[PDB]
Symmetry: C3
Subunit: 335 residues, 3 copies
Amino acid sequence: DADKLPHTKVTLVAPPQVHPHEQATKSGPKVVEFTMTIEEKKMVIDDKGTTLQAMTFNGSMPGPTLVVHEGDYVQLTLVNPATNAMPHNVDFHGATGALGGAKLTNVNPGEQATLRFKADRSGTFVYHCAPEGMVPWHVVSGMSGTLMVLPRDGLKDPQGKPLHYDRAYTIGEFDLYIPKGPDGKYKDYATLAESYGDTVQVMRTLTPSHIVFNGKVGALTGANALTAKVGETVLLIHSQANRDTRPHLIGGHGDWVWETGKFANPPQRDLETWFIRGGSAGAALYTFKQPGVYAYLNHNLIEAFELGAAGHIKVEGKWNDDLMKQIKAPAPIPR
Amino acid sequence: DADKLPHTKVTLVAPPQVHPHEQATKSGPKVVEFTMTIEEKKMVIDDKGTTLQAMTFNGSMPGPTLVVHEGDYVQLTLVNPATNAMPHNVDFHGATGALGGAKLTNVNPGEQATLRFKADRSGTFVYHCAPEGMVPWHVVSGMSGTLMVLPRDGLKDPQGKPLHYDRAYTIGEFDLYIPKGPDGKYKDYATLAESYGDTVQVMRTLTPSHIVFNGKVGALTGANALTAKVGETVLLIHSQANRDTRPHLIGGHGDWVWETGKFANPPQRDLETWFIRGGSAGAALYTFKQPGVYAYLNHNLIEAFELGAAGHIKVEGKWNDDLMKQIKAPAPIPR
Amino acid sequence: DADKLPHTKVTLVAPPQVHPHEQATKSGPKVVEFTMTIEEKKMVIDDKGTTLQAMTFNGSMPGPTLVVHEGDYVQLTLVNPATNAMPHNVDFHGATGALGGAKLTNVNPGEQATLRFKADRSGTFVYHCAPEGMVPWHVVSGMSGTLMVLPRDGLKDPQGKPLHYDRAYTIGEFDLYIPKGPDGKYKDYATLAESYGDTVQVMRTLTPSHIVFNGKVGALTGANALTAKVGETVLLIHSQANRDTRPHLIGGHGDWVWETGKFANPPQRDLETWFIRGGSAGAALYTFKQPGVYAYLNHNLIEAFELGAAGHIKVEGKWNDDLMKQIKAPAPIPR
Ligand SMILES: [Cu+2]
Ligand SMILES: [Cu+2]
Ligand SMILES: [Cu+2]
Ligand SMILES: [Cu+2]
Ligand SMILES: [Cu+2]
Ligand SMILES: [Cu+2]
Ligand SMILES: [Zn+2]
Ligand SMILES: [Zn+2]
Ligand SMILES: [Zn+2]
């Protein structure tokens, strides 16, 4: 019975960071309290100025990652401010009953609600908005994120040996469906409601205009690249609420991967490319061994390089000639 | 040697039901006898009256599910009545040799044949029609279904502990390719043969017009929803003979899932969304814990809500506030 | 330290063959030396004369398969002759650092280079070209292949029991994006550089014009079918550097399958259809039990039969009535 448990309050952080948390814990179960505020807004999603009439949890695509442990209760206050036009709700894949909580969290602008559910299964789980009759539109417009439910004793390998990460990053991948007018240029809409019909027509083609990490082409590149150093283990959380994707670290590997994202199952090792089913979150560990700029991308290379599904990780440290060496630099072919 | 085994006769039932059968059995091997009769017919596949020039095993999409045990022999009489226009056959993925039996079951209208093969591998396996030079057309037009080969000692978890189901439902998901005329409306064809050319042109786009469960948008909703009650374990058999899909129970989980559909492999637990490769059948167990109306759908949410790949399960029983509770109903945001 | 190891030289062979190699080996680690020469050329890819402005490793799609053992070093000399127009490089998914080696192998026409890396992970791994700003184009134009890194003690089943193959075949599957002019016919380009813009436009549609095994519709059919005999175990290596595929043997199975392609993970058994994620290579074993002509294909049946992703295996030996028997040949339905 959850009425008599300790309560705790978590402050969420913006992706690609994940809020402070423990992996293995000596703690017993708690009610962990979170709040999220819905924001509708127009967003620039590419380098040429294209806009999306977007919908977000907490002002970001994806929403923030929520972290608890197996046996905890998640208690979320979902706030829909009066500045928004549309009703919203939340469907937690990590939860049992009531369409993931969607039936109990229907909030119109100016309303809020509080849902509690038991996080009784370990793994990374999508959450997303799911208003009746509008579900795909809200999802593709940006309303998704990850709940990570860690085992109380932390992550385990297939033999039950301990695994860990030293830093965690959360990547949401969004297939977008931006309409075009008769001149072949992307449409710019003055309100969210006026983008709907044209967008639905593009959706039904099943061909995204853009496929982006974290809300924009280039979101995780340049000054916003992810960072690590040789000898550090990174956890890459990858959510796709609507459409399959195939993550790959160029120059690296998935050392241990839960591609279905559920930690009571053994992970696979040594992956070049893994698969995240649309409507799921998966999780990869990798310990860096070489310094340099890596690319983390969807390995449909059209979706990555043409449509936007690619980011960078900048890694500090010492080069290792045992793992890789340039034996002869590029040079003229011998006479 | 199968000539000296006991024979048994199974009466098939219409999807989404599965014929009566045992899971673990004290029985030794038998020749299990089935009959199916091909029916070509025009079918209404959406709410706006669109038709498909369809092709079926036994009058349904999908065909009925055939259930035997590992070590049994399947002995199928395939009947192609003279009222049909086209030749047909059957390729059982569960079988070894002769293109799954297709080479030995070529039946023209007014013909029949009887094939026997050993069901020596456990799992859910697609069967489908595969006439030379017409294979994709027959498949996408409706000619597929599932053979379920159960282990003689029933289903097992990764530690070899027993698993079971209390009721079984079979879901076939069909990507359809309905042509349109110059006015943008779907074409209605007076015969099956006259739909072919236009359909092939749509197929080669790889963009389905509709993606439906069990032959129609809404087939498994309203008065035709699947049913269960809290504490009952349901087995959901999901076949897709042509194109990938990503099943998800909204408000539930895949408790134990064989997404490649082969029961000699350990299942994965706690899945939010699983993957059925085109050309396969997979199987999920879930034990209900909350009452209510769940949605079972393809979690490409465009494919589900826009194109038709979604159904309902109506579950009886007592609500559980431990698993989920509305802490505060929707209400105005505080002054 | 690799400077003091034995060196060996491997002569590569054209797909679908794989060069001579051992499975389990008493050998310790070596530096294994390979050379590949890039060739740009125009290729006929279908039966109606359509051309592709192609790019290859060693004159074939896919490139040749390189085979080493876990703990070996791969030492590749990559040659870009002056007869080529474009710069090239190589990204080995099996390698760690420097974008898979791409950063250390940038070769302009008339240049070469030599890269060494440690093959420290077992599995089948894609390699492909990855020039800055042109990555998808080079890949879809043909520049990919497989590195197979075998465990030093050979392949193992989930219980650690030995597995083997008697012959190995390598299949590369290429999604192609051939543009069309205003008359609806495929364009023929006089040079590689003149195909680029039009091709990029087709790529961004995500709809391939053709999907072929080994460079052409029908490449692995007729006089070029793969061959085996009853009682022989075949290893089918399946690479797709850009786009998902779903291999299936019609009339057969995947006896043991590593669909993510990484041999330190247990294989799945009894598969009807497996999944190769775009940007990966996977591996299936099957021991033939029936003679005849099998089809090995992508089980999106449109992609197979309409677009080209299908081949044949011709199998010698004795028919087995226990596994399959025609009980009654096709005949009129009884009076
Ligand atoms: Cu919403
Ligand atoms: Cu969902
Ligand atoms: Cu047929
Ligand atoms: Cu098939
Ligand atoms: Cu290149
Ligand atoms: Cu790559
Ligand atoms: Zn307006
Ligand atoms: Zn007519
Ligand atoms: Zn010219």
